[PDB]
């Protein structure tokens, strides 16, 4: 329970993989996947590590956030795909940053992480 899973195929056209049940999402910028191809991408986000529902362990699990298992371990990309996950830690904003600049913290709600090799 309390688990959010999202499985779906992508293409060079572009798309996104988001799980409202959790929040984490994955944007596929036009160019991450080759044309005339279908890249099956999925992932499961959840606060519980033991409550994780069986998806595809033997297939290959690639953890990203506190507990988020991407699709099959080993999925190259021809473009830095956008991945967003909850940080849950305000210790990456206050560090000699700009007092009048939003960049000093306007990125705590979600961690912008690019993936070019699963």
From Swiss-Prot:
Tissue expr: The alpha-containing isoform is found in most epithelial cell junctions. The short isoform is found both in endothelial cells and the highly specialized epithelial junctions of renal glomeruli and Sertoli cells of the seminiferous tubules.
The ZU5 domain, residue ranges: 4-118
Record localization: Cell membrane; Cell junction, Tight junction; Cell junction; Cell junction, Gap junction
PTM annotation, UniProt: Phosphorylated at tyrosine redidues in response to epidermal growth factor (EGF). This response is dependent on an intact actin microfilament system. Dephosphorylated by PTPRJ.
Source taxon at top rank: Eukaryota
Function statement: TJP1, TJP2, and TJP3 are closely related scaffolding proteins that link tight junction (TJ) transmembrane proteins such as claudins, junctional adhesion molecules, and occludin to the actin cytoskeleton. Forms a multistranded TJP1/ZO1 condensate which elongates to form a tight junction belt, the belt is anchored at the apical cell membrane via interaction with PATJ. The tight junction acts to limit movement of substances through the paracellular space and as a boundary between the compositionally distinct apical and basolateral plasma membrane domains of epithelial and endothelial cells.
Subunit structure: Homodimer. Forms heterodimers TJP3. Forms a heterodimer (via PDZ2 domain) with TJP2/ZO2 (via PDZ2 domain). Interacts with OCLN, CALM, claudins, CGN/cingulin, CXADR, GJA12, GJD3 and UBN1. Interacts (via ZU5 domain) with CDC42BPB and MYZAP. Interacts (via PDZ domain) with GJA1. Interacts (via PDZ domains) with ANKRD2. Interacts with POPDC1 (via the C-terminus cytoplasmic tail). Interacts with HSPA4 and KIRREL1. Interacts with DLL1. Interacts with USP53 (via the C-terminal region). Interacts (via ABR region) with F-actin.
Annotated domain remarks: The 244-aa domain between residues 633 and 876 is the primary occludin (OCLN)-binding site and is required for stable association with the tight junction.
Family: Belongs to the MAGUK family.
Protein name: Tight junction protein 1
């Amino acid at each position: 329970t309390v688990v959010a899973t999202a499985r779906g195929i992508f293409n060079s056209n572009g798309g996104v993989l988001s799980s409202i049940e959790t929040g984490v999402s994955i944007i596929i910028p036009q160019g991450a996947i080759p044309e005339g191809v279908e890249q099956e991408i999925y992932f499961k986000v959840c606060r519980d590590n033991s409550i994780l529902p069986p998806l595809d362990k033997e297939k290959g699990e690639t953890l990203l956030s506190p507990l988020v298992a991407a699709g099959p371990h080993g999925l190259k990309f021809l473009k830095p795909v956008e991945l967003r996950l909850p940080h849950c830690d305000p210790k990456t904003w206050q560090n000699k940053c700009l007092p009048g600049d939003p960049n000093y913290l306007v990125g705590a709600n979600c961690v912008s992480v690019l993936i070019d090799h699963f």
